[PDB]
């Protein structure tokens, strides 16, 4: 299965991802974890590799993937 690596930031805990269902799975601080479906692999690498994981999650994911609240 797949595991959420811990990231510092002031909004995100952790993200994790499973190349399998092509599923990124984002822990936010405030408001719970959320998965993302149907995310390429390489943007869950760029979301790894940004500056800041804010404004590539404001950027790049939020909105721009079908996501659903996990709990």
């Known amino acids: 299965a797949m595991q959420r690596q811990p990231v510092s930031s002031s909004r995100i805990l952790s993200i994790g991802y499973d190349?399998?269902?092509r599923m990124l799975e984002i822990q936010f601080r405030e408001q719970g974890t959320y998965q993302y479906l149907g995310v390429p692999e390489r943007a869950h690498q760029n979301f790894m590799?940004?500056?800041?994981?804010?404004?590539?999650?404001?950027?790049?994911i939020k909105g721009k993937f079908l996501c659903r609240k996990i709990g």
Do not use: E, I, L, Q
């Open 19 to 21: 190349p399998d269902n």
């Open 49 to 60: 590799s940004a500056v800041s994981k804010g404004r590539f999650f404001d950027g790049v």
